[model samples]
Target: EVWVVGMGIVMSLIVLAIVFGNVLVITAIAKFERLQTVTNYFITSLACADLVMGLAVVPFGAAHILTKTWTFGNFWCEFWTSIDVLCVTASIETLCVIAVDRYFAITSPFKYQSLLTKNKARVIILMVWIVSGLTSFLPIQMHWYRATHQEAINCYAEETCCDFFTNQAYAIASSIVSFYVPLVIMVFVYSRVFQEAKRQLQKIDKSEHKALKTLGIIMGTFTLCWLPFFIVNIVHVIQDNLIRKEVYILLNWIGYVNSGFNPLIYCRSPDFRIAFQELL
Candidate 1:
């Protein structure tokens, strides 16, 4: 009872903070015309994704954390999980896009405006949404959302509503597209960007300073939050052992905490800071 009540309080605070912070971000961007740059457009999309996750996934996840099993029916079991995956993946991909965009602007400013036009960025943003949605929801619809179980107890305990994770085929397919592919892309882009930033502006300037600071906060938050979960997942794929169950649970919670941290990190940007000030 004590644990449950304490968790409830914590989640309530997180929920409130996420909602209020994201609302400030959204309003700040919408109202401040100067802040409505092409990059800020993508930033807003991330905020929207995080907002949706906070509103939809966190409550459901809280229930699971406290209850030990998913009480929601099979439909919701698949639906909520799908939403959780879709929004989180979308946010990550959007961040990658931002990194690449900034790299172009900083390293190749002469051609940046022409290459990353408004329409092109919009199209890429659209792809981020569509790809994430398809990756997250298609498998669920194809009955890959649940794992097969011999006993009702396992089914109920594991929430095998649709059977996707246990399906070795689905597991490989989804993990490749959702996890591996994105990981590769983000790392490659960020590496190139970092190298370019170093080559062009080794000495600190206002822009480089700001960019490093922003990237550090964003990437650091992402790496800290997602790295453990990704590492545990890789271990599970390679070794699939039970000795690390507690560690996996801890990592999963840490990854979920990412959804709450994004808005806080993002709002640190000068534009977002101004937006926050104006929103107040």
Candidate 2:
């Protein structure tokens, strides 16, 4: 009916916006001379991951949500799941690397040039992708994620198997590595960055650059978006009866929203604002 049509329009809007915005970020960073830097490299990688999610993963998810079933075959479901985990893990790891890069930059402005060369940055991004593979495709394909390894195929032998199904160990370890640890590291990074900013401001008695409000929002949106999904996921493993299916999907969508936010956050920078406009 009209209600479903309206919902479809909204979901399409989300996907279109995410795809278009991340495309712009990736293109501007890649094409423009001024935007090429170590930090921008990490950001472009993040945009790439977000681009895959919006274009490849999210559209099928919309169909699954609206149709209330996995219309695509079991093979595609598994493929989608693999890509989903890959993209998200890649995005989070890139952010962690970015945070560390910024920490070194702010902590030692003079030493950062030699400390964080492009080679080091590229290697770290490569490592991020490798880690993403281990967390996603490795576990899913090896059947380590399932509670019963001997069970039938097709995501626990079911016909409509499109959602995540994993054992307690996989859940705990994946969430810890993919979400918790990186978040902890970034939080500490920004904490020091903020303190350093204020210290410089007080010592020099000038505040032209201001605080880390915008940067903090970048991390803040990531936390606010993904935290609910992780907390609910782990808590569901603890007590499955507590969380409803609808609420679980709601949390999943919240995590998905973060992909659309980074490019928006990039606009906070004056350089990005002009560069993005030039692309437009």
Residue lDDT tens for model 2, 149-258: 44435555786767675788888998998999999999899989888888877888764444666666767688788888999889877785898878988888888888
Candidate 1's displacement at residue 11, Å, is 1.6
Q: Considering every candidate listed, which one attains the maximal TM-score?
A: 2
For candidate 2, list the clashing residue pairs, or say none.
none
Q: Report lDDT (Cα) of residue 217, candidate 2.
A: 72
Please list the C-alpha lDDT of all candidates, in the order they appear.
Answer: 0.72, 0.83
Task: Give the Cα error of residue 100 in candidate 1, in Å.
Answer: 1.1
User: Across residues 24-140, which tens digit of lDDT does each residue of candidate 1 receive?
Assistant: 778888887888788788888988988897789887777777776666678787787688779778877887777777667767777877897688878898898999999888876
In model 2, what lDDT does residue 205 have? 71
